[PDB]
Amino acid sequence: MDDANKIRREEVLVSMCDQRARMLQDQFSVSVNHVHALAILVSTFHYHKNPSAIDQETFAEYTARTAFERPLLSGVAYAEKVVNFEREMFERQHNWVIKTMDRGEPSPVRDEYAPVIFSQDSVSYLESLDMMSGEEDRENILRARETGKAVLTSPFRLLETHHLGVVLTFPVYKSSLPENPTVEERIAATAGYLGGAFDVESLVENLLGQLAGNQAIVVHVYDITNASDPLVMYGNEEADRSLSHESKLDFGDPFRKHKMICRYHQ
Amino acid sequence: DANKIRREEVLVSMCDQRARMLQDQFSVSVNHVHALAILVSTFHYHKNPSAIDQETFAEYTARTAFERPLLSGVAYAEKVVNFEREMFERQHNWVIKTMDRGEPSPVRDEYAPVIFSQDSVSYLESLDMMSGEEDRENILRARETGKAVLTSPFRLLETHHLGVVLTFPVYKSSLPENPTVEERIAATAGYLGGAFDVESLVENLLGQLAGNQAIVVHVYDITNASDPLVMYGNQDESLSHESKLDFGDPFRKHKMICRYHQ
Ligand SMILES: CC(C)=CCNc1ncnc2[nH]cnc12
Numbered sequence: 225m226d227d228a229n230k231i232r233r234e235e236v237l238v239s240m241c242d243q244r245a246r247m248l249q250d251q252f253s254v255s256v257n258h259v260h261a262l263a264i265l266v267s268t269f270h271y272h273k274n275p276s277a278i279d280q281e282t283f284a285e286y287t288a289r290t291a292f293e294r295p296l297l298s299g300v301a302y303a304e305k306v307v308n309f310e311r312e313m314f315e316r317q318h319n320w321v322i323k324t325m326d327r328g329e330p331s332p333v334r335d336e337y338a339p340v341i342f343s344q345d346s347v348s349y350l351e352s353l354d355m356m357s358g359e360e361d362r363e364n365i366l367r368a369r370e371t372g373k374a375v376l377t378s379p380f381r382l383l384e385t386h387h388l389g390v391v392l393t394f395p396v397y398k399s400s401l402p403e404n405p406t407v408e409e410r411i412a413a414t415a416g417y418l419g420g421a422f423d424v425e426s427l428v429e430n431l432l433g434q435l436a437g438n439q440a441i442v443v444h445v446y447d448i449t450n451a452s453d454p455l456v457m458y459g460n461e462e463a464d465r466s467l468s469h470e471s472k473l474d475f476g477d478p479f480r481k482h483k484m485i486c487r488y489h490q
Numbered sequence: 491d492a493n494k495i496r497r498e499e500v501l502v503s504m505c506d507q508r509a510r511m512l513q514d515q516f517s518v519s520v521n522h523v524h525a526l527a528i529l530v531s532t533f534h535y536h537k538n539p540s541a542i543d544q545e546t547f548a549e550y551t552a553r554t555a556f557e558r559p560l561l562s563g564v565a566y567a568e569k570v571v572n573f574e575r576e577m578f579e580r581q582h583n584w585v586i587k588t589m590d591r592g593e594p595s596p597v598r599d600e601y602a603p604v605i606f607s608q609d610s611v612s613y614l615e616s617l618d619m620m621s622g623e624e625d626r627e628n629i630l631r632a633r634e635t636g637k638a639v640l641t642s643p644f645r646l647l648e649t650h651h652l653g654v655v656l657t658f659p660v661y662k663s664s665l666p667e668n669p670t671v672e673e674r675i676a677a678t679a680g681y682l683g684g685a686f687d688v689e690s691l692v693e694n695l696l697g698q699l700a701g702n703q704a705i706v707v708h709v710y711d712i713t714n715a716s717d718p719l720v721m722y723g724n725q726d727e728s729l730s731h732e733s734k735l736d737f738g739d740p741f742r743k744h745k746m747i748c749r750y751h752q
């Protein structure tokens with residue numbers, strides 16, 4: 225009841241919320257950094273090395289053993305850029321046809337595709353799917369290759385699990401990429417895309433649910449890239465309407481903006 | 491009186507933040523070194539034939555140097571028992587050398603010659619890492635425990651910078667589940683090591699920070715409470731603050747101490 229006890233109640237909410245936001249941001253940063261390393265791994269060991277040291281079995285083993293390096297990711301995979309002129313060749317060599325993600329059916333003719341050729345076993349269902357056949361993934365692929373940096377999607381429901389999450393995509397370039405490249409040069413030099421699924425729904429719940437005081441607090445995360453159209457990234461709910469705190473979150477993609485809001489159940 | 495209280499609060503805040511930064515950067519480096527140990531296992535031992543070589547290791551480690559902020563370099567030393575030495579040297583077209591003089595190694599029961607190296611530590615190639623006592627002890631404890639280990643602070647090769655070495659064991663696929671120490675030794679393939687150059691890279695980390703001229707910072711290895719060893723700072727023997735550090739090796743203990751000059 226007391227006004228003095230209310231000041232401390234807010235102080236505790238601020239502290240709890242700020243700590244959770246720091247944990248989320250730090251663990252995502254750690255995961256992005258290890259995805260960057262995987263992109264370098266594919267470049268060095270698959271493309272640069274003659275012959276390639278990476279087959280599906282090798283990729284699966286390495287990513288399984290390093291899963292702890294990528295705490296907020298449910299799986300990683302590598303999609304190769306295939307232009308239509310090359311598609312029949314690519315399919316004959318791999319002995320499978322490029323499929324659409326919505327039904328796993330053979331892809332119709334498209335100018336280019338991004339079929340998954342290597343996958344962590346946790347996302348084995350991605351193998352042979354054209355990652356340009358989902359709009360969130362397609363937009364991510366384009367912005368990754370044009371900018372040279374890790375990029376994030378808006379929140380959407382992921383394949384197979386239908387869990388609400390975001391996808392992280394990094395470009396992989398050919399050795400022909402010029403120094404100080406233009407966007408056009410980046411596109412021309414694109415080899416493929418290293419993608420990771422941030423399963424926010426399952427993995428952020430797991431992270432938050434183990435923390436002391438979790439039952440006292442309601443935590444929501446929003447994508448606020450468009451101020452007038454906030455999108456739920458994490459969270460549902462009967463909460464305390466009188467008091468809230470907003471904690472800062474920076475997931476590292478300047479194209480996107482996010483925030484965390486905590487309230488008491490009370 | 492009020493100003494003395496504020497002075498204490500600033501000291502605690504300054505010291506705690508530096509400790510956090512140092513612990514976090516150490517942690518990130520340790521984790522990325524662990525990934526490299528896994529990479530050598532997967533590519534050099536699990537694949538047959540081996541699908542990693544010096545060229546590839548040098549490229550990958552150069553390109554990922556940013557992932558390992560406090561490390562001057564990383565290298566992989568392979569376990570070689572004496573009966574295998576002749577075959578090993580013929581395969582590599584070099585002789586196993588001592589760390590102190592680069593002379594051909596006398597006969598030893600076993601050796602840990604560096605076979606892969608980041609170019610920043612290229613001078614380690616062919617050196618027997620068991621011919622230096624800090625590295626030797628680290629190698630033994632790494633392989634017997636199955637986990638990352640740290641040395642005491644000591645002066646590193648070439649640069650003479652005061653630092654600590656981080657060593658991870660790499661095992662053969664014959665390693666049993668829930669292995670004994672004896673099983674770990676038998677299954678050892680080699681050792682992935684990284685040099686934490688404290689004298690240079692921690693100075694770079696902490697030295698640039700605002701407020702640095704107002705305080706004295708030390709990091710101590712306090713594994714032996716009665717014989718603390720300087721890891722960072724000067725050799726000097728009221729108002730101090732101790733901030734916690736955990737560098738991840740249960741065998742070792744560390745602390746940061748900060749004081750005002752006046
Ligand atoms: C480029 C690449 C391999 C992206 C990874 N994308 C995805 N990874 C895993 N699940 C998903 N569901 C929808 N998109 C998903």
Ligand SMILES: CC(C)=CCNc1ncnc2[nH]cnc12
Binds near residue numbers: 563645655683684
């Ligand atoms: C096992 C392994 C390769 C250890 C790395 N050890 C070291 N690495 C870099 N420089 C050093 N100077 C002395 N020991 C050093």
